[PDB]
Amino acid sequence: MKPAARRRARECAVQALYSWQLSQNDIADVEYQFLAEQDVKDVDVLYFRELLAGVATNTAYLDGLMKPYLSRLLEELGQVEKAVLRIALYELSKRSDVPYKVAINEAIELAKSFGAEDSHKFVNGVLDKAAPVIRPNKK
C-alpha cells in the first residue's frame, strides 16, 4: 500500500476506452479486461469491470458533463483523451472522497500523459465545465 499508487485502473481504463472504438467488442468486460491482460502489476479489477456497464447504460448521463464542452464532435477530439475525460465525468459522481474542482487537475494529466500534448491545457477546462454537473455542489 503506497500513496504513490492510486490504482492505475481508473486512468488505465481510457486505454481500454480506446480499444472499444477500434475493437468495438463487448464493452463492460472488454475495457477492464485490458488491465488483467498483459499482467498490469497483477491487481484485482473485477469490480472495476462493472463500472463500464454504467457508461453502457448511462452514457448519455455522462454526456451531461460534456454537454457544456463538445468540441464539434466527441469522436473527433483526441480518441484516448476524449475517453480519458469521459471516465473522469463519472469520477465526479463516484467521488469516493474527492471534490469536483480537484478532479479538474486530473484532466490535463489524463490528456497530457494519457493522450497527446499541445492541446492538453484545453482538456483541463472541459473538466471545469463538465465537473460542476454530475455534482452541483459548487464548492
UniProtKB/Swiss-Prot annotation:
Keywords: Ribosome biogenesis, RNA-binding, Transcription, Transcription antitermination, Transcription regulation
GO annotations of cellular component type: cytosol; transcription elongation factor complex
Annotated CDD domains: Terminator_NusB
Lineage: superkingdom: Bacteria
Disruption phenotype: Inactivation of the gene causes cold-sensitive cell growth.
Pfam families linked: NusB
GO terms of molecular function: RNA binding
GO biological-process terms attached to the record: DNA-templated transcription termination; regulation of DNA-templated transcription elongation; ribosome biogenesis; transcription antitermination
PANTHER family to which the protein is assigned, alphabetical: ANTITERMINATION NUSB DOMAIN-CONTAINING PROTEIN (PTHR11078:SF3), N UTILIZATION SUBSTANCE PROTEIN B-RELATED (PTHR11078)
Swiss-Prot/TrEMBL domain comment: The N-terminal region functions as an arginine-rich RNA-binding motif (ARM).
Family, similarity comment: Belongs to the NusB family.
Record's function text: Part of the processive rRNA transcription and antitermination complex (rrnTAC). The complex forms an RNA-chaperone ring around the RNA exit tunnel of RNA polymerase (RNAP). It supports rapid transcription and antitermination of rRNA operons, cotranscriptional rRNA folding, and annealing of distal rRNA regions to allow correct ribosome biogenesis. Involved in transcription antitermination. Required for transcription of ribosomal RNA (rRNA) genes. Binds specifically to the boxA antiterminator sequence of the ribosomal RNA (rrn) operons.
Assembly mode: Monomer in solution. Forms a heterodimer with the ribosomal protein S10. The rRNA transcription and antitermination complex (rrnTAC) consists of RNAP, NusA, NusB, NusE (rpsJ), NusG, SubB, ribosomal protein S4, DNA and precursor rRNA; S4 is more flexible than other subunits.
The name this protein goes by in its record: Transcription antitermination protein NusB
Lineage per the UniProt record: Bacteria, Pseudomonadati, Pseudomonadota, Gammaproteobacteria, Enterobacterales
